[PDB]
C-alpha cells in the first residue's frame, strides 16, 4: 500500500508510453485522478520542452548507456541512481528524469522493444520514490508539482 | 530520503544481529533513537515470545546458500500479504527473519544484512501507508506498552 508509488508509476508510465506510441491512454485514472491528469498535462508541456532544450545531452547519454535489451533496462538502475541523486532535489531534476525516461522510451520503440517501456518506468518510479521520498512528501507531492509549474 | 526505511532497517537488522550473535551493537542509534531503542526492547520481549511459541511452523517454513537469500522475497511477500494487517504479523515477520538469521549464523553471518534489507523492503513497501499511519515505531511501542 504505497499511494505515492502508485500515482507516480501511473503518471510516469502513462507519459512514457504516450510519448512513444503518440496516443493517449484514455483508460480511467485511479485515486486522485484529477491530480494525476493535471500532472500528466504539466509533464506533457514542461517535459517536451525539456526534451527539446537538452536534445544533445539526452542523445549522448542514450548513446553511452547502450540500452539494447531488457537486461540493460534492469542494469541502468545503478547509474540512474548515481546521476539523479546529486543531492540537489528540485522539481526540474524530476522533470528531467521523466523526460529522459520518455526519450529513452521513444528510442525503445524505435528499436523493436516496446516490451521494455513498462519496466523502465517502474525503475524510474522506484528511484524517485526511494531516493527522494520524504522530500516529495514535504512538497505536498504531485499537488505541489502541478502547483509549481503553474504559469 | 526515506527515514521510515532507515529506522526500520536499523531496528530489524539490529534485532536479527543481536539474536544471531548474542552481542549488542553498542553504537548509538540514528535519528529518533529514543523510539528505536524501545522498539528493539519491545521486539526482544514479544519477538522472543513469538519465536518460542512458533518454533515448529518456523522450522517448517525454512525447508523450502547465499544465492537464495534474494529469493525468499517472493514467498515472504505472499505469506505476509496473507492474513490481516496487524502489528503481530509484522512482529511475526521480524521474529521469523531472526530465526532464519540464526540459521545463517550457524551455517554461514554473510547473508544476515541482505535478509534484513529484504524484510524491511517488503514491510515498508507493502504496508507503507499503514506504517506512516500509527505513527510508525512510536505506535509499535505504544501497542505493546507494559
Ligand atoms: C540535462 C543534461 C544531461 C542529462 C541527461 C540525461 C539525464 C539527466 C539527469 C537526470 C539524472 C538521472 O537520469 C537518468 C540517468 C540514467 C538513466 C536514466 C534512464 C531513464 C530516466 C532517467 C535516467 C540530469 C540531472 C539531474 O539529476 N541531467 C541529465 C547531461 C548529461 O549528458 C551526458 C552525455 C553523454 C555522457 C554523459 C552525460 N547534460 N545536460 C545538460
Question: Could you tell me the resolution of this structure in angstroms?
Answer: 2.8
Of A48, A42, A46, A45, nearest in space to A20 by CA: A48
Instruction: Confirm if A57 and A106 have CB atoms less than 8 A apart.
Output: no
> SS3 breakdown of chain B: % helix, strand, coil, rounded to 5?
75, 0, 25
Best probe residue, ligand 1, of A57, A62, A81, A129 (max atoms within 8 Å of C-beta): A57
- Residue B108 contacts A, CB cutoff 8 Å: no
CA of A64 relative to ligand 1 center, distance in Å: 11
CB contact (8 A) between residue B129 and residue A5: no
Tell me the three state secondary structure of residue B63.
Answer: coil
Instruction: Confirm if A93 and A101 have CB atoms less than 8 A apart.
Output: no
* Spatial separation of the C-alpha atoms in residues A122 and A127, rounded to whole Å: 8
What are the boundaries of each domain within chain A?
Answer: 3-148
Residues 6+ apart with CB under 8 A from B68: none
* Spatial separation of the C-alpha atoms in residues A105 and A100, rounded to whole Å: 8
The C-alpha of A109 sits at a distance from chain B's nearest C-alpha, in angstroms, of: 31
Residues 6+ apart with CB under 8 A from B39: B11, B137, B140, B141
> Which residue in the block uniquely carries the three cell numbers 539474536?
B19
Check whether domain B3-20+31-143 has CATH 1.10.437.10, yes or no: yes
Instruction: Report angle CA B43, B91, B107 to the nearest 5 degrees.
Output: 80
DSSP for A98-140 reads: HHHHHHHHHHHHHTT-GGGHHHHHHHHHHHHHHHTHHHHHHTT
DSSP for A9-72 reads: HHHHHHHHHHHHHSS---SPP-TTHHHHHHHHHHHHHHHHHHHHHSHHHHHHHHHHHT--SHHH
Q: How was this structure determined?
A: X-ray
* Spatial separation of the C-alpha atoms in residues A104 and A67, rounded to whole Å: 9
Q: Is A61 in the pocket of ligand 1 (CB under 6 A)?
A: yes
**Assigned superfamily of A3-148:** Blc2-like (1.10.437.10)
What number of other Cβ atoms are within 10 A of residue A23's Cβ?
8
The C-alpha of A63 sits at a distance from chain B's nearest C-alpha, in angstroms, of: 30
Amino acid at each position: 500500500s504505497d499511494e505515492l508509488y502508485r500515482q507516480s508509476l501511473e503518471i510516469i508510465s502513462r507519459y512514457l508510453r504516450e510519448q512513444a506510441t503518440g496516443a493517449k491512454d484514455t483508460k480511467p485514472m485511479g485515486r486522485s485522478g484529477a491530480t494525476s491528469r493535471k500532472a500528466l498535462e504539466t509533464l506533457r508541456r514542461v517535459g517536451d520542452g525539456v526534451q527539446r532544450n537538452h536534445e544533445t545531452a539526452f542523445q549522448g547519454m542514450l548513446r553511452k548507456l547502450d540500452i539494447k535489451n531488457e537486461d540493460d533496462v534492469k542494469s541502468l538502475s545503478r547509474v540512474m541512481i548515481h546521476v539523479f541523486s546529486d543531492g540537489v532535489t528540485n522539481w526540474g531534476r524530476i522533470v528531467t528524469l521523466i523526460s529522459f525516461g520518455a526519450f529513452v522510451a521513444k528510442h525503445l520503440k524505435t528499436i523493436n522493444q516496446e516490451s521494455c517501456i513498462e519496466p523502465l518506468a517502474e525503475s524510474i518510479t522506484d528511484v524517485l520514490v526511494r531516493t527522494k521520498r520524504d522530500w516529495l512528501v514535504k512538497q505536498r507531492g504531485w499537488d505541489g508539482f502541478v502547483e509549481f509549474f503553474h504559469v
